Amino acid sequence: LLATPMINNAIRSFLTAWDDIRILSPDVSSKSLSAYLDSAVANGPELII
């Protein structure tokens, strides 16, 4: 972490600003990926009567 402070300070601005990519990064809804899939099931027609 050696840089003139003005330069080192500049890195923090860039580094954190891309930390808000990680607050909404890969979605933890891997179980609810099926709940994304479950939203399309109920508009299935009843073929079998």
Binding site: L2, A3, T4, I7
Partner: protein, 49 residues
């Protein structure tokens, strides 16, 4: 008696400009000089042979 003020005293007297951001003396001085066990790895290697 491996005394590390012989390696350090040769690198510290090379002259470099302080106006450069990345300073190639302070990198290698960070690389080796933090010291763990006064450099006893060398004895282990020799012991193992």
């Amino acid at each position: 008696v491996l005394d590390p003020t012989v390696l350090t005293n040769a690198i510290t007297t090379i002259s470099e400009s302080t106006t450069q951001t990345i300073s190639p003396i302070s990198e290698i001085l960070r690389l080796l000089q933090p010291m763990g066990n006064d450099y006893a790895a060398f004895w282990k290697c020799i012991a193992s042979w």
